[PDB]
Amino acid sequence: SSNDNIELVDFQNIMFYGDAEVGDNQQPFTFILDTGSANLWVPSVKCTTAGCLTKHLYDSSKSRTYEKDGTKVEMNYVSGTVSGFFSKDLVTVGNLSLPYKFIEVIDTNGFEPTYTASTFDGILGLGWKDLSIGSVDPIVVELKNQNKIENALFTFYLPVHDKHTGFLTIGGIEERFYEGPLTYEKLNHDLYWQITLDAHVGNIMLEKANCIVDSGTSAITVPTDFLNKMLQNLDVIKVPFLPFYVTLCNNSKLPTFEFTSENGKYTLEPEYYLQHIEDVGPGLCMLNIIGLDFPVPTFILGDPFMRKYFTVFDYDNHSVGIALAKKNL
Numbered sequence: 001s002s003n004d005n006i007e008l009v010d011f012q013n014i015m016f017y018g019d020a021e022v023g024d025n026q027q028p029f030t031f032i033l034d035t036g037s038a039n040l041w042v043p044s045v046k047c048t049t050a051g052c053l054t055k056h057l058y059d060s061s062k063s064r065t066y067e068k069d070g071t072k073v074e075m076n077y078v079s080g081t082v083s084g085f086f087s088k089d090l091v092t093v094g095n096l097s098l099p100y101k102f103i104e105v106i107d108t109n110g111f112e113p114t115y116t117a118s119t120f121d122g123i124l125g126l127g128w129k130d131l132s133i134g135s136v137d138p139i140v141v142e143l144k145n146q147n148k149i150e151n152a153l154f155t156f157y158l159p160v161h162d163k164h165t166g167f168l169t170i171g172g173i174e175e176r177f178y179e180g181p182l183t184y185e186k187l188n189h190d191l192y193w194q195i196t197l198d199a200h201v202g203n204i205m206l207e208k209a210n211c212i213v214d215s216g217t218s219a220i221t222v223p224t225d226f227l228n229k230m231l232q233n234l235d236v237i238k239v240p241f242l243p244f245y246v247t248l249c250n251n252s253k254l255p256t257f258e259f260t261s262e263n264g265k266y267t268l269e270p271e272y273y274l275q276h277i278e279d280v281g282p283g284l285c286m287l288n289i290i291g292l293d294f295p296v297p298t299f300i301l302g303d304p305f306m307r308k309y310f311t312v313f314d315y316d317n318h319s320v321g322i323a324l325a326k327k328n329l
């Protein structure tokens, strides 16, 4: 195809990963491909933490195209912190490469045990420029500016456990990934891939909610008050002292998420947010839903939403395209 494709690998049906390389000798890494952030980083050989020793590491000395920056930098994620300095080298994604600014992480201890538990080496942000630390132009925009792709856009077709692999496609929209109408939602900020949707779940309704499409989050998140009201009398159980909700797997009262705009309507059935714990009798399940409050009431449409819906991230048109993902390729 005319486009750039990076294969997405499924990992336990909740997170997915893809590979990319740094250096002219193309040192390989496994990344969370993250529309929810906007910085690229890789752990350095100069990182000597226990976590780093389990990872693929970046050695600048083995790359002839490496150029020094050294500006100190600290990334603060919700989970925790990685710190290091900026560096510039050739970044290769699929069959395209470009000189790019990224973070060499030298310290990983403030990001444990998350980092060691996970199978990524680093994170490759895919958000907008103002979301990045150090104001780094997004890779896809740069690739567009350099006429290495036709459009400044990328698309996610998520993998499903041994049924099909997935693709991050850079440069154009491929009809093989979706069926039915492809609908566009204008961004309400050039920051996250964030759009405005009315959110209906059951008895509760929130008009014009902020919805962030986030491939770097494996849950759906919901405002805490909304989540409370959502589950009342639904035979869902809050686990004491933990943030988890648990239910019988055959619970017919489990509601379907409904997100609507003037342009389209998207729904998410229990099938996409039920996690099976033990399939004894009626079955014990856990909701893949997290209560979480932002200054503005916000839904985070993470991987479960994207597993049902093929999504298009269009820099040129400042919008998110949504369509029903094909069940198989």
Ligand SMILES: CCCN(CCC)C(=O)c1cc(C(=O)N/C(=C\c2ccccc2)[C@H](O)CNC(C)(C)c2cccc(OC)c2)cc(N2CCCCC2)c1
Residues within 6 Å of the ligand: 014, 015, 032, 034, 036, 037, 077, 078, 079, 114, 118, 123, 192, 212, 214, 216, 217, 218, 219, 221, 290, 300, 302
């Ligand atoms: C199921 C286990 C896998 N996992 C964490 C282990 C790697 C997650 O999917 C996860 C990812 C993020 C996260 O920050 N994702 C991002 C990057 C990332 C960083 C480190 C590891 C993995 C991914 C995104 O960049 C964050 N996106 C934004 C900024 C919009 C955001 C902000 C605030 C909360 C949030 O999570 C929904 C997402 C946050 C969380 N939460 C949300 C509930 C409370 C506990 C922490 C979970």
